[PDB]
């Protein structure tokens, strides 16, 4: 099991961001061995924390490390452009493995908040008369540029058939992103709605659709 | 110390992934020696290490399908993956491991995992009920280009990252936002363009 982390944090320059870690007794708890990764689009993920609190040479003070029983913490004081990236922790797990977890997007405020518009298309009679029926979720006109997306079928969770796209950046520097379930003809016919539900910055954001 | 993971790039279904970390700028006759891997879908895996004297860990969720070897004469390690899928399509990063944490990382390389060969996209009109859409399914490989009425519609207009879906085969959906009172007028066309398979699509929407 993947350690948690939230999935998005966002602070204005020169202010504050505190990231969480949530693992067991087995891993986070159990050992002073928690790391933390920074990671830019492309580029090698580099260690910016170890041992719970210590920092490698080269890495700024501003970065520090905590721990509270099974919750590590990351803390990235004075915010900085360059701060901007993803961040994982790791740790230790016992028995020469280790577990990373889930990953956590650091913004950098430039611009202002916005909850997504959120468009869910039925699959089309065409599709459909090629046998296949496809749930498209497309997410437009967000920021900070990260969102979670919740597949219902009659209001319950779905998790097969689910793919969604990682946030990409629009001409208008806003996010957008999508999401996809992908079923059988009769499938789409077995549940009375489907919903898409996109979580961002505290708020929902849920359509629905009927056949 | 530098890790360059190299590697086949595409791999067919149920095949063996294999790749290979050269390193320079130190020995891999020291230290532990680590593969992890970035699902487009998830956080960092861990997959495992190899000490220096030949001693091997591994995910004991991968272990059973997992090999990590040393290749000490050119300096590299490998790992191989049995019977690969669609849920190990995934950036494969190696990196050094010492004193509980990974010092050195690569800057990793995408294996695709598909069986497919080349095919053209459908592509399907998502009508308004203002936003419309095409959702440009089933092709393979990468890339398709999307253009609204042959470039002349831009605002509005967003296409999408592909997924890659477990059948091998990639989707991607374009849709635009259009004054509601333009749908009798005006006519919304998607051009869609997948030069591998030498299609081009036109669909006009509603």
């Known amino acids: 099991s993947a350690l948690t982390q939230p999935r998005s944090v966002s602070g204005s320059p020169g202010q504050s961001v505190t990231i969480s870690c949530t693992g067991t007794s087995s891993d986070v708890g159990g050992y002073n061995y928690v790391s933390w990764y920074q990671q830019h689009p492309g580029k090698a993920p580099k260690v910016m924390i170890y041992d719970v609190s210590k920092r490698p040479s080269g890495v700024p003070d501003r970065f520090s490390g905590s721990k509270s029983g099974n919750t590590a913490s990351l803390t990235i004081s004075g915010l900085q452009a360059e701060d901007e990236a993803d961040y994982y922790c790791?740790?230790?797990?016992?028995?020469?493995?280790?577990?990373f977890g889930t990953g956590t997007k650091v913004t950098v405020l430039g611009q202002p908040k916005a909850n997504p518009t959120v468009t869910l298309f039925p699959p089309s009679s065409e599709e459909l008369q090629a046998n296949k029926a496809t749930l498209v979720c497309l997410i437009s006109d967000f920021y900070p540029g990260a969102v979670t997306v919740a597949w219902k079928a009659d209001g319950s969770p779905v998790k097969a058939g689910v793919e969604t796209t990682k946030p990409s950046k629009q001409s208008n520097n806003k996010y957008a992103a999508s999401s996809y379930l992908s079923l059988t003809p009769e499938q789409w016919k077995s549940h009375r709605s489907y919903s898409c539900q996109v979580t961002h910055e505290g708020s929902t954001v849920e359509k629905t659709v009927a056949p | 110390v530098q890790l360059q993971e190299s590697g086949p790039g595409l791999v067919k279904s149920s095949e063996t992934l294999s790749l290979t970390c050269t390193v320079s700028?130190?020995?891999?006759?020291?230290?532990?020696w680590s593969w992890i891997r970035q699902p487009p879908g998830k956080g960092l895996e861990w997959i495992g290490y190899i000490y220096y004297s030949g001693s091997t860990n591994y995910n004991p969720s991968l272990k059973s399908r997992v090999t990590i070897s040393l290749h000490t004469s050119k300096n590299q390690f490998s790992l191989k993956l049995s019977s690969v899928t669609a849920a190990d399509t995934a950036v494969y990063y190696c990196?050094?491991?010492?004193?509980?944490?990974?010092?050195?990382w690569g800057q990793g390389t995408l294996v695709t995992v598909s069986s497919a060969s080349t095919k053209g996209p459908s592509v399907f009109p998502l009508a308004p009920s203002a936003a419309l859409g095409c959702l440009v399914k089933d092709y393979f490989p990468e890339p398709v280009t999307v253009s609204w009425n042959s470039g002349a519609l831009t605002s509005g207009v967003h296409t999408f990252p592909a997924v890659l879906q477990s059948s091998g085969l990639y989707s991607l959906s374009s849709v635009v936002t259009v004054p509601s009172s333009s749908l009798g007028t005006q006519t919304y066309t998607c051009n869609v363009d997948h030069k591998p398979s030498n299609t081009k699509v036109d669909k006009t929407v509603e």
């Open positions: 790791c740790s230790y797990a016992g028995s020469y493995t280790y577990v």
């Open positions: 990196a050094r491991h010492r004193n509980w944490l990974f010092d050195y």
């Open positions: 700028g130190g020995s891999i006759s020291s230290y532990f």
